[PDB]
Design an enzyme around this catalytic site. Structure first.
Site, PDB file in Angstrom:
ATOM      1  N   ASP A  60     -12.365   9.363  -7.538  1.00 19.03           N
ATOM      2  CA  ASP A  60     -13.549   9.972  -6.968  1.00 19.03           C
ATOM      3  C   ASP A  60     -13.237  11.227  -6.132  1.00 19.03           C
ATOM      4  O   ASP A  60     -14.176  11.759  -5.514  1.00 19.03           O
ATOM      5  CB  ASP A  60     -14.325   8.932  -6.147  1.00 19.03           C
ATOM      6  N   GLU A 101       0.835  -1.199   0.000  1.00 25.19           N
ATOM      7  CA  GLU A 101       0.000   0.000   0.000  1.00 25.19           C
ATOM      8  C   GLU A 101       0.869   1.249   0.000  1.00 25.19           C
ATOM      9  O   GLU A 101       0.554   2.241  -0.650  1.00 25.19           O
ATOM     10  CB  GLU A 101      -0.894   0.009   1.208  1.00 25.19           C
ATOM     11  N   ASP A 125     -15.264  -4.396   9.691  1.00 26.85           N
ATOM     12  CA  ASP A 125     -16.558  -3.928   9.209  1.00 26.85           C
ATOM     13  C   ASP A 125     -17.268  -4.936   8.292  1.00 26.85           C
ATOM     14  O   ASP A 125     -18.239  -4.565   7.625  1.00 26.85           O
ATOM     15  CB  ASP A 125     -16.386  -2.594   8.489  1.00 26.85           C
ATOM     16  N   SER A 152     -11.476  11.312  -3.399  1.00 26.99           N
ATOM     17  CA  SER A 152     -10.990  10.969  -2.085  1.00 26.99           C
ATOM     18  C   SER A 152      -9.470  10.791  -2.151  1.00 26.99           C
ATOM     19  O   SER A 152      -8.880  10.761  -3.209  1.00 26.99           O
ATOM     20  CB  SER A 152     -11.652   9.692  -1.575  1.00 26.99           C
ATOM     21  N   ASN A 183      -7.599   9.492  -5.403  1.00 29.27           N
ATOM     22  CA  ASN A 183      -8.404   8.602  -6.229  1.00 29.27           C
ATOM     23  C   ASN A 183      -9.277   9.399  -7.200  1.00 29.27           C
ATOM     24  O   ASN A 183      -9.603  10.565  -6.969  1.00 29.27           O
ATOM     25  CB  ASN A 183      -9.289   7.713  -5.343  1.00 29.27           C
ATOM     26  N   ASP A 209      -6.144   8.501  -0.251  1.00 24.71           N
ATOM     27  CA  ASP A 209      -5.664   7.470   0.683  1.00 24.71           C
ATOM     28  C   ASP A 209      -4.435   7.978   1.450  1.00 24.71           C
ATOM     29  O   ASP A 209      -3.551   8.590   0.862  1.00 24.71           O
ATOM     30  CB  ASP A 209      -5.253   6.180  -0.050  1.00 24.71           C
ATOM     31  N   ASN A 248      -8.731   5.512   3.391  1.00 25.77           N
ATOM     32  CA  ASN A 248      -9.388   6.371   2.404  1.00 25.77           C
ATOM     33  C   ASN A 248     -10.245   7.448   3.072  1.00 25.77           C
ATOM     34  O   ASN A 248     -10.992   7.182   4.034  1.00 25.77           O
ATOM     35  CB  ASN A 248     -10.238   5.505   1.469  1.00 25.77           C
TER      36      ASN A 248
END
Ligand SMILES: [Cl-]
Ligand SMILES: [Cl-]
Length: 129
Positions: free
Chosen positions: A48, A35, A101, A50, A46, A52, A59
Site C-alpha cells: 500500500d 519483525e 488499541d 506505507s 508495503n 514499516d 507502520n
C-alpha cells in the site's frame, strides 16, 4: 544497532514492556526477532505505499510520519526515522500505544504467525534480567 537477544530483553524490561497489557517479555523479544531480526534500522515497504520501521516494524500508515505515506495518521506523533534509533525508547513508547488499541499484539503479523501460542519464554531464557 543489532541487539543481542538478552540485551534487547533487558532494554525492553527497563522500558516497561514486561507484562505490558499482559504480554510477557518473551512475546516482545520474539516479535522483535521475527519483525526485524533485532535490527533497529530495519525498514520494509508495503504494497500500500506505507513502510514499516525499526525493531518492531511500526507502520507509517497509522503510527509514524515518513512524509511519503498519503493519509498517514501519525498516531504516535513521531517521525518514522525516530524509530530507527539505537535507543529503543521511541519504538517502545509507540508499541505501547499500538498494543493498547484493542488488537493487542495481533497488530504484529510476525508475532501472530511465529510467536503467539509458542513457548515465548524461551526468548528470554538464560538472560540476566
Ligand atoms: Cl516470557
Ligand atoms: Cl509472518
Amino acid at each position: 544497532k543489532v541487539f543481542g537477544r538478552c540485551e534487547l530483553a533487558a532494554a525492553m524490561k527497563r522500558h516497561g514492556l514486561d507484562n505490558y497489557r499482559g504480554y510477557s517479555l518473551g512475546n516482545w523479544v520474539c516479535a522483535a526477532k521475527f519483525e526485524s531480526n533485532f535490527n533497529t534500522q530495519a525498514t520494509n515497504r508495503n504494497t500500500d505505499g506505507s513502510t514499516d520501521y525499526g525493531i518492531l516494524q511500526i507502520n507509517s500508515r497509522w503510527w509514524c510520519n515518513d512524509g511519503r505515506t498519503p493519509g498517514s495518521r501519525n498516531l504516535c506523533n513521531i517521525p518514522c526515522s525516530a524509530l530507527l534509533s539505537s535507543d529503543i525508547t521511541a519504538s517502545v513508547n509507540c508499541a505501547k500505544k499500538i498494543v493498547s488499541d484493542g488488537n493487542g499484539m495481533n497488530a504484529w503479523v510476525a508475532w501472530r504467525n511465529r510467536c503467539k501460542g509458542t513457548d515465548v519464554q524461551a526468548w528470554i531464557r538464560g538472560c540476566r534480567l
